[PDB]
Amino acid sequence: LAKRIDAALIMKDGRVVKGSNFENLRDSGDPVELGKFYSEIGIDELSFWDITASVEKRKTMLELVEKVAEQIDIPFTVGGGIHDFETASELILRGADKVEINTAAVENPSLITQIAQTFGSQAVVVYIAAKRVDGEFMVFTYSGKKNTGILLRDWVVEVEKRGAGEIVLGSIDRLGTKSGYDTEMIRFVRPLTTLPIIAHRGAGKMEHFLEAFLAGADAAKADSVFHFREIDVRELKEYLKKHGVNVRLE
């Protein structure tokens, strides 16, 4: 299939955390308006990641999904502390196409299967945050705070076995950096799974997307490099097409 370009939007109390540099927008911190704009300039799928600390979180995420679904016509994922089936189910029913789970899946891998039983594997995205520790790739949970001691190699295989649809491979070794995706990590995981692999963390320039696809990623996700306009999405797609990557153009 075509390689996919995804934008992730970090959200808190209904606002895009740190906003965006698109002066054309009425509200460059409105996740709905920013997502719509991305969907019109060539992003293929959107991820919305909520860090609303608790009490209002569940209603906030539901209202976000509802507003996004009304306005955008490309697939989107919602994530951020989805811990059980009923939470996932209400978000999908309210409009999300996929849910993106990490810590709760590691703690109870049957959650992957439970969501997929009702909504299909394609509705379940597992975000794997991994880091090198003593020469092994290890899985981390709780926003990078906890080394689970679970090997990336074992967790990728289990995630597919449990019925996930896609894996987002986030390199903690690239968090905050702009040096490139962790192509070694992507190459490590590629032979272990038939699932789509979505690279995350490390992108700083268009060439980094080419590198990630050469490494075997099926999609590449980024956030601040788009929001602060270090990379233009349309230029990126034109660049990838020029160098032989199958991406969707308009």
PDB file of C-alpha atoms in Angstrom:
ATOM      1  CA  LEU A   1       0.000   0.000   0.000  1.00  0.00           C
ATOM      2  CA  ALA A   2       0.825   3.700  -0.138  1.00  0.00           C
ATOM      3  CA  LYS A   3       3.022   4.913   2.691  1.00  0.00           C
ATOM      4  CA  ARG A   4       0.965   7.076   5.024  1.00  0.00           C
ATOM      5  CA  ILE A   5       1.767  10.484   6.605  1.00  0.00           C
ATOM      6  CA  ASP A   6       0.070  11.002  10.012  1.00  0.00           C
ATOM      7  CA  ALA A   7      -0.161  14.134  12.182  1.00  0.00           C
ATOM      8  CA  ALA A   8      -0.521  13.778  15.946  1.00  0.00           C
ATOM      9  CA  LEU A   9      -2.087  16.551  18.024  1.00  0.00           C
ATOM     10  CA  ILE A  10      -1.413  16.649  21.780  1.00  0.00           C
ATOM     11  CA  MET A  11      -4.412  18.035  23.589  1.00  0.00           C
ATOM     12  CA  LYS A  12      -5.137  19.233  27.130  1.00  0.00           C
ATOM     13  CA  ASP A  13      -8.405  20.673  28.458  1.00  0.00           C
ATOM     14  CA  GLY A  14      -9.662  20.846  24.851  1.00  0.00           C
ATOM     15  CA  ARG A  15      -6.716  22.829  23.434  1.00  0.00           C
ATOM     16  CA  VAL A  16      -3.774  21.885  21.262  1.00  0.00           C
ATOM     17  CA  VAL A  17      -0.846  21.936  23.687  1.00  0.00           C
ATOM     18  CA  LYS A  18       1.548  24.663  22.410  1.00  0.00           C
ATOM     19  CA  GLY A  19      -0.778  25.379  19.452  1.00  0.00           C
ATOM     20  CA  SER A  20       0.543  25.865  15.922  1.00  0.00           C
ATOM     21  CA  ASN A  21       2.044  28.484  13.602  1.00  0.00           C
ATOM     22  CA  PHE A  22      -0.717  28.559  10.983  1.00  0.00           C
ATOM     23  CA  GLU A  23      -1.682  32.247  11.003  1.00  0.00           C
ATOM     24  CA  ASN A  24      -4.530  31.519   8.582  1.00  0.00           C
ATOM     25  CA  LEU A  25      -6.439  29.610  11.279  1.00  0.00           C
ATOM     26  CA  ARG A  26      -9.090  31.418  13.303  1.00  0.00           C
ATOM     27  CA  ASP A  27      -7.789  29.599  16.388  1.00  0.00           C
ATOM     28  CA  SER A  28      -4.435  27.887  15.823  1.00  0.00           C
ATOM     29  CA  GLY A  29      -4.968  26.063  19.171  1.00  0.00           C
ATOM     30  CA  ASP A  30      -8.337  24.562  18.194  1.00  0.00           C
ATOM     31  CA  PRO A  31      -7.663  20.876  17.594  1.00  0.00           C
ATOM     32  CA  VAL A  32     -10.720  20.611  15.368  1.00  0.00           C
ATOM     33  CA  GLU A  33      -9.785  23.484  13.082  1.00  0.00           C
ATOM     34  CA  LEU A  34      -6.120  22.460  12.968  1.00  0.00           C
ATOM     35  CA  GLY A  35      -7.049  18.843  12.207  1.00  0.00           C
ATOM     36  CA  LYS A  36      -9.388  19.932   9.426  1.00  0.00           C
ATOM     37  CA  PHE A  37      -6.666  22.064   7.876  1.00  0.00           C
ATOM     38  CA  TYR A  38      -4.207  19.148   7.984  1.00  0.00           C
ATOM     39  CA  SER A  39      -6.811  16.929   6.318  1.00  0.00           C
ATOM     40  CA  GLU A  40      -7.088  19.474   3.485  1.00  0.00           C
ATOM     41  CA  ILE A  41      -3.399  19.924   2.838  1.00  0.00           C
ATOM     42  CA  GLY A  42      -2.473  16.264   2.544  1.00  0.00           C
ATOM     43  CA  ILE A  43      -2.222  14.542   5.932  1.00  0.00           C
ATOM     44  CA  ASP A  44      -3.536  11.030   5.514  1.00  0.00           C
ATOM     45  CA  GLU A  45      -4.670  10.233   9.062  1.00  0.00           C
ATOM     46  CA  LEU A  46      -4.835  12.177  12.325  1.00  0.00           C
ATOM     47  CA  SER A  47      -4.035  11.126  15.883  1.00  0.00           C
ATOM     48  CA  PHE A  48      -5.473  13.056  18.820  1.00  0.00           C
ATOM     49  CA  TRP A  49      -3.756  12.469  22.147  1.00  0.00           C
ATOM     50  CA  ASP A  50      -5.439  13.744  25.289  1.00  0.00           C
ATOM     51  CA  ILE A  51      -3.665  14.542  28.558  1.00  0.00           C
ATOM     52  CA  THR A  52      -6.553  16.183  30.306  1.00  0.00           C
ATOM     53  CA  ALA A  53      -5.867  15.336  33.948  1.00  0.00           C
ATOM     54  CA  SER A  54      -8.642  13.481  35.072  1.00  0.00           C
ATOM     55  CA  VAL A  55     -12.070  14.549  36.091  1.00  0.00           C
ATOM     56  CA  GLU A  56     -13.123  16.213  32.889  1.00  0.00           C
ATOM     57  CA  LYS A  57     -11.041  13.900  30.739  1.00  0.00           C
ATOM     58  CA  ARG A  58     -13.695  11.365  29.693  1.00  0.00           C
ATOM     59  CA  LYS A  59     -16.270  13.965  28.634  1.00  0.00           C
ATOM     60  CA  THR A  60     -13.526  16.087  27.056  1.00  0.00           C
ATOM     61  CA  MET A  61     -12.312  13.235  24.885  1.00  0.00           C
ATOM     62  CA  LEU A  62     -15.851  12.302  23.875  1.00  0.00           C
ATOM     63  CA  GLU A  63     -16.710  15.868  22.868  1.00  0.00           C
ATOM     64  CA  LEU A  64     -13.436  16.078  20.918  1.00  0.00           C
ATOM     65  CA  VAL A  65     -14.206  12.905  18.969  1.00  0.00           C
ATOM     66  CA  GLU A  66     -17.724  14.108  18.230  1.00  0.00           C
ATOM     67  CA  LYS A  67     -16.558  17.498  16.928  1.00  0.00           C
ATOM     68  CA  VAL A  68     -13.687  16.000  14.889  1.00  0.00           C
ATOM     69  CA  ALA A  69     -15.913  13.412  13.230  1.00  0.00           C
ATOM     70  CA  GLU A  70     -18.405  16.109  12.142  1.00  0.00           C
ATOM     71  CA  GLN A  71     -15.699  18.140  10.431  1.00  0.00           C
ATOM     72  CA  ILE A  72     -13.002  15.840   9.021  1.00  0.00           C
ATOM     73  CA  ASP A  73     -13.336  13.077   6.426  1.00  0.00           C
ATOM     74  CA  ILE A  74     -10.016  11.232   6.812  1.00  0.00           C
ATOM     75  CA  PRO A  75      -9.466   8.457   9.445  1.00  0.00           C
ATOM     76  CA  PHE A  76      -8.486   9.453  12.919  1.00  0.00           C
ATOM     77  CA  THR A  77      -7.263   7.852  16.092  1.00  0.00           C
ATOM     78  CA  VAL A  78      -7.872   8.946  19.683  1.00  0.00           C
ATOM     79  CA  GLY A  79      -5.582   8.024  22.589  1.00  0.00           C
ATOM     80  CA  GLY A  80      -4.330   9.062  25.980  1.00  0.00           C
ATOM     81  CA  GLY A  81      -5.110   6.974  29.009  1.00  0.00           C
ATOM     82  CA  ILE A  82      -7.685   4.659  27.439  1.00  0.00           C
ATOM     83  CA  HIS A  83      -7.707   1.915  30.056  1.00  0.00           C
ATOM     84  CA  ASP A  84     -10.630  -0.414  29.352  1.00  0.00           C
ATOM     85  CA  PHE A  85     -13.048  -1.640  26.738  1.00  0.00           C
ATOM     86  CA  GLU A  86     -15.960   0.576  27.680  1.00  0.00           C
ATOM     87  CA  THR A  87     -13.826   3.723  27.382  1.00  0.00           C
ATOM     88  CA  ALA A  88     -12.530   2.590  23.972  1.00  0.00           C
ATOM     89  CA  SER A  89     -16.026   1.595  22.840  1.00  0.00           C
ATOM     90  CA  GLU A  90     -17.646   4.923  23.689  1.00  0.00           C
ATOM     91  CA  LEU A  91     -14.909   6.814  21.824  1.00  0.00           C
ATOM     92  CA  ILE A  92     -15.260   4.680  18.683  1.00  0.00           C
ATOM     93  CA  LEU A  93     -19.054   4.859  18.746  1.00  0.00           C
ATOM     94  CA  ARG A  94     -18.921   8.645  19.197  1.00  0.00           C
ATOM     95  CA  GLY A  95     -16.850   8.934  16.031  1.00  0.00           C
ATOM     96  CA  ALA A  96     -13.229   7.813  16.283  1.00  0.00           C
ATOM     97  CA  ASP A  97     -12.051   5.296  13.705  1.00  0.00           C
ATOM     98  CA  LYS A  98      -9.338   3.814  15.896  1.00  0.00           C
ATOM     99  CA  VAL A  99      -8.183   3.891  19.469  1.00  0.00           C
ATOM    100  CA  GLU A 100      -4.485   4.055  20.378  1.00  0.00           C
ATOM    101  CA  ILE A 101      -3.528   2.199  23.609  1.00  0.00           C
ATOM    102  CA  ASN A 102      -0.201   1.606  25.326  1.00  0.00           C
ATOM    103  CA  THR A 103       0.066   1.187  29.109  1.00  0.00           C
ATOM    104  CA  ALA A 104      -3.295  -0.504  29.559  1.00  0.00           C
ATOM    105  CA  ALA A 105      -2.505  -2.964  26.776  1.00  0.00           C
ATOM    106  CA  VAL A 106       0.836  -3.928  28.286  1.00  0.00           C
ATOM    107  CA  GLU A 107      -0.827  -4.453  31.651  1.00  0.00           C
ATOM    108  CA  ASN A 108      -3.719  -6.459  30.201  1.00  0.00           C
ATOM    109  CA  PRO A 109      -2.996  -7.612  26.656  1.00  0.00           C
ATOM    110  CA  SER A 110      -6.459  -9.167  26.446  1.00  0.00           C
ATOM    111  CA  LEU A 111      -7.722  -5.542  26.150  1.00  0.00           C
ATOM    112  CA  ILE A 112      -6.381  -5.595  22.562  1.00  0.00           C
ATOM    113  CA  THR A 113      -8.479  -8.648  21.732  1.00  0.00           C
ATOM    114  CA  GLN A 114     -11.550  -7.378  23.554  1.00  0.00           C
ATOM    115  CA  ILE A 115     -11.637  -4.136  21.556  1.00  0.00           C
ATOM    116  CA  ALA A 116     -10.893  -5.997  18.281  1.00  0.00           C
ATOM    117  CA  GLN A 117     -13.663  -8.549  18.939  1.00  0.00           C
ATOM    118  CA  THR A 118     -16.276  -5.777  18.676  1.00  0.00           C
ATOM    119  CA  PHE A 119     -14.618  -3.165  16.476  1.00  0.00           C
ATOM    120  CA  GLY A 120     -12.238  -5.213  14.351  1.00  0.00           C
ATOM    121  CA  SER A 121      -8.452  -5.306  14.451  1.00  0.00           C
ATOM    122  CA  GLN A 122      -8.323  -2.211  12.274  1.00  0.00           C
ATOM    123  CA  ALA A 123      -9.799  -0.149  15.137  1.00  0.00           C
ATOM    124  CA  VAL A 124      -6.958  -1.068  17.552  1.00  0.00           C
ATOM    125  CA  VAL A 125      -3.611   0.738  17.389  1.00  0.00           C
ATOM    126  CA  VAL A 126      -0.986  -0.247  19.942  1.00  0.00           C
ATOM    127  CA  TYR A 127       1.563   2.447  20.713  1.00  0.00           C
ATOM    128  CA  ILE A 128       4.854   0.800  21.753  1.00  0.00           C
ATOM    129  CA  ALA A 129       7.286   3.182  23.475  1.00  0.00           C
ATOM    130  CA  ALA A 130      10.723   1.528  23.413  1.00  0.00           C
ATOM    131  CA  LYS A 131      14.249   2.401  24.492  1.00  0.00           C
ATOM    132  CA  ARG A 132      17.673   0.760  24.497  1.00  0.00           C
ATOM    133  CA  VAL A 133      18.607  -0.555  27.936  1.00  0.00           C
ATOM    134  CA  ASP A 134      21.830  -2.502  28.449  1.00  0.00           C
ATOM    135  CA  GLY A 135      21.909  -3.299  24.740  1.00  0.00           C
ATOM    136  CA  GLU A 136      18.303  -4.553  24.380  1.00  0.00           C
ATOM    137  CA  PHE A 137      15.199  -2.811  23.156  1.00  0.00           C
ATOM    138  CA  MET A 138      12.797  -2.678  26.134  1.00  0.00           C
ATOM    139  CA  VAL A 139       9.149  -1.643  26.375  1.00  0.00           C
ATOM    140  CA  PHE A 140       8.287   1.375  28.572  1.00  0.00           C
ATOM    141  CA  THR A 141       4.927   2.395  30.010  1.00  0.00           C
ATOM    142  CA  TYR A 142       3.502   5.368  31.927  1.00  0.00           C
ATOM    143  CA  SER A 143       4.731   7.991  29.463  1.00  0.00           C
ATOM    144  CA  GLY A 144       8.242   6.626  29.478  1.00  0.00           C
ATOM    145  CA  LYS A 145       8.477   6.402  33.264  1.00  0.00           C
ATOM    146  CA  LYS A 146       8.511   2.620  33.708  1.00  0.00           C
ATOM    147  CA  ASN A 147      10.880   0.062  32.192  1.00  0.00           C
ATOM    148  CA  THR A 148       8.578  -2.972  32.059  1.00  0.00           C
ATOM    149  CA  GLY A 149      11.427  -5.399  31.539  1.00  0.00           C
ATOM    150  CA  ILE A 150       9.497  -6.744  28.534  1.00  0.00           C
ATOM    151  CA  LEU A 151      11.547  -7.091  25.374  1.00  0.00           C
ATOM    152  CA  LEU A 152      10.345  -5.172  22.335  1.00  0.00           C
ATOM    153  CA  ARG A 153      10.806  -8.368  20.293  1.00  0.00           C
ATOM    154  CA  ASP A 154       8.403 -10.269  22.551  1.00  0.00           C
ATOM    155  CA  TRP A 155       5.816  -7.529  22.874  1.00  0.00           C
ATOM    156  CA  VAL A 156       5.556  -6.931  19.096  1.00  0.00           C
ATOM    157  CA  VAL A 157       4.802 -10.612  18.555  1.00  0.00           C
ATOM    158  CA  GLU A 158       2.246 -10.677  21.372  1.00  0.00           C
ATOM    159  CA  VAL A 159       0.515  -7.510  20.136  1.00  0.00           C
ATOM    160  CA  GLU A 160      -0.090  -9.092  16.729  1.00  0.00           C
ATOM    161  CA  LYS A 161      -1.198 -12.370  18.334  1.00  0.00           C
ATOM    162  CA  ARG A 162      -3.732 -10.490  20.474  1.00  0.00           C
ATOM    163  CA  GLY A 163      -5.325  -8.938  17.379  1.00  0.00           C
ATOM    164  CA  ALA A 164      -4.043  -5.376  17.072  1.00  0.00           C
ATOM    165  CA  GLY A 165      -4.369  -3.700  13.691  1.00  0.00           C
ATOM    166  CA  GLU A 166      -1.324  -1.428  13.669  1.00  0.00           C
ATOM    167  CA  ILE A 167       1.748  -0.707  15.762  1.00  0.00           C
ATOM    168  CA  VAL A 168       3.087   2.796  16.411  1.00  0.00           C
ATOM    169  CA  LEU A 169       6.750   2.376  17.264  1.00  0.00           C
ATOM    170  CA  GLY A 170       7.812   5.359  19.356  1.00  0.00           C
ATOM    171  CA  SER A 171      11.506   5.647  20.106  1.00  0.00           C
ATOM    172  CA  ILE A 172      12.121   7.180  23.525  1.00  0.00           C
ATOM    173  CA  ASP A 173      15.786   7.411  22.374  1.00  0.00           C
ATOM    174  CA  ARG A 174      14.530  10.097  19.879  1.00  0.00           C
ATOM    175  CA  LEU A 175      12.116  12.039  22.095  1.00  0.00           C
ATOM    176  CA  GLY A 176      12.627  15.766  21.568  1.00  0.00           C
ATOM    177  CA  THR A 177      15.313  15.178  18.986  1.00  0.00           C
ATOM    178  CA  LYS A 178      15.282  16.231  15.368  1.00  0.00           C
ATOM    179  CA  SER A 179      18.021  13.851  14.173  1.00  0.00           C
ATOM    180  CA  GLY A 180      15.774  11.373  12.387  1.00  0.00           C
ATOM    181  CA  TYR A 181      13.480   8.474  13.110  1.00  0.00           C
ATOM    182  CA  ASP A 182      15.020   5.498  14.916  1.00  0.00           C
ATOM    183  CA  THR A 183      15.543   3.509  11.728  1.00  0.00           C
ATOM    184  CA  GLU A 184      17.549   0.817  13.565  1.00  0.00           C
ATOM    185  CA  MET A 185      14.537   0.234  15.803  1.00  0.00           C
ATOM    186  CA  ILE A 186      12.191   0.124  12.798  1.00  0.00           C
ATOM    187  CA  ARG A 187      14.474  -2.365  11.037  1.00  0.00           C
ATOM    188  CA  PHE A 188      14.580  -4.479  14.182  1.00  0.00           C
ATOM    189  CA  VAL A 189      10.811  -4.712  14.406  1.00  0.00           C
ATOM    190  CA  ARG A 190      10.027  -5.054  10.672  1.00  0.00           C
ATOM    191  CA  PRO A 191      10.708  -8.812  10.334  1.00  0.00           C
ATOM    192  CA  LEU A 192       8.830  -9.648  13.553  1.00  0.00           C
ATOM    193  CA  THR A 193       5.329  -8.535  12.484  1.00  0.00           C
ATOM    194  CA  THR A 194       3.067  -8.387   9.445  1.00  0.00           C
ATOM    195  CA  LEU A 195       1.224  -5.412  10.892  1.00  0.00           C
ATOM    196  CA  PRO A 196       1.622  -1.831   9.620  1.00  0.00           C
ATOM    197  CA  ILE A 197       4.374  -0.072  11.482  1.00  0.00           C
ATOM    198  CA  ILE A 198       3.976   3.658  12.121  1.00  0.00           C
ATOM    199  CA  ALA A 199       7.243   5.407  13.038  1.00  0.00           C
ATOM    200  CA  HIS A 200       7.141   8.092  15.744  1.00  0.00           C
ATOM    201  CA  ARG A 201       9.749  10.398  17.385  1.00  0.00           C
ATOM    202  CA  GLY A 202      12.842  11.985  15.898  1.00  0.00           C
ATOM    203  CA  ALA A 203      11.629  13.535  12.607  1.00  0.00           C
ATOM    204  CA  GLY A 204      13.222  16.905  11.849  1.00  0.00           C
ATOM    205  CA  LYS A 205      13.396  17.159   8.054  1.00  0.00           C
ATOM    206  CA  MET A 206      11.743  15.646   4.978  1.00  0.00           C
ATOM    207  CA  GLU A 207      14.617  13.220   4.336  1.00  0.00           C
ATOM    208  CA  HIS A 208      13.967  11.557   7.689  1.00  0.00           C
ATOM    209  CA  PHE A 209      10.612  10.333   6.331  1.00  0.00           C
ATOM    210  CA  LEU A 210      12.325   8.765   3.322  1.00  0.00           C
ATOM    211  CA  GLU A 211      14.766   7.021   5.692  1.00  0.00           C
ATOM    212  CA  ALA A 212      11.932   5.662   7.844  1.00  0.00           C
ATOM    213  CA  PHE A 213      10.161   4.207   4.811  1.00  0.00           C
ATOM    214  CA  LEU A 214      13.392   2.648   3.560  1.00  0.00           C
ATOM    215  CA  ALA A 215      13.678   1.058   7.004  1.00  0.00           C
ATOM    216  CA  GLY A 216      10.280  -0.608   6.459  1.00  0.00           C
ATOM    217  CA  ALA A 217       7.813   1.755   8.126  1.00  0.00           C
ATOM    218  CA  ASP A 218       4.342   1.768   6.553  1.00  0.00           C
ATOM    219  CA  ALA A 219       3.514   5.206   7.928  1.00  0.00           C
ATOM    220  CA  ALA A 220       5.314   8.033   9.660  1.00  0.00           C
ATOM    221  CA  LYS A 221       3.761  10.160  12.384  1.00  0.00           C
ATOM    222  CA  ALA A 222       4.945  13.557  13.584  1.00  0.00           C
ATOM    223  CA  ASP A 223       3.572  16.500  15.506  1.00  0.00           C
ATOM    224  CA  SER A 224       5.668  19.581  16.381  1.00  0.00           C
ATOM    225  CA  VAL A 225       7.621  19.518  13.054  1.00  0.00           C
ATOM    226  CA  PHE A 226       4.279  20.100  11.347  1.00  0.00           C
ATOM    227  CA  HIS A 227       2.625  22.377  13.916  1.00  0.00           C
ATOM    228  CA  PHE A 228       5.563  24.759  14.029  1.00  0.00           C
ATOM    229  CA  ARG A 229       6.017  24.438  10.244  1.00  0.00           C
ATOM    230  CA  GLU A 230       9.550  23.067  10.176  1.00  0.00           C
ATOM    231  CA  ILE A 231       8.176  20.681   7.526  1.00  0.00           C
ATOM    232  CA  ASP A 232       5.387  21.541   5.083  1.00  0.00           C
ATOM    233  CA  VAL A 233       3.084  18.575   4.536  1.00  0.00           C
ATOM    234  CA  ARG A 234       2.537  19.180   0.831  1.00  0.00           C
ATOM    235  CA  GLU A 235       6.272  19.725   0.231  1.00  0.00           C
ATOM    236  CA  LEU A 236       6.935  16.521   2.131  1.00  0.00           C
ATOM    237  CA  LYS A 237       4.553  14.509  -0.028  1.00  0.00           C
ATOM    238  CA  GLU A 238       6.029  16.033  -3.200  1.00  0.00           C
ATOM    239  CA  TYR A 239       9.516  15.207  -1.965  1.00  0.00           C
ATOM    240  CA  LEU A 240       8.620  11.592  -1.136  1.00  0.00           C
ATOM    241  CA  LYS A 241       6.936  11.076  -4.509  1.00  0.00           C
ATOM    242  CA  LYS A 242       9.954  12.572  -6.348  1.00  0.00           C
ATOM    243  CA  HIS A 243      12.230   9.968  -4.756  1.00  0.00           C
ATOM    244  CA  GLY A 244      10.028   6.997  -5.541  1.00  0.00           C
ATOM    245  CA  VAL A 245       7.861   6.587  -2.413  1.00  0.00           C
ATOM    246  CA  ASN A 246       4.260   5.628  -3.058  1.00  0.00           C
ATOM    247  CA  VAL A 247       2.325   8.374  -1.237  1.00  0.00           C
ATOM    248  CA  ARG A 248      -1.147   9.719  -1.921  1.00  0.00           C
ATOM    249  CA  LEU A 249      -1.169  13.096  -3.698  1.00  0.00           C
ATOM    250  CA  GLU A 250      -3.976  15.477  -4.778  1.00  0.00           C
TER     251      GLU A 250
END
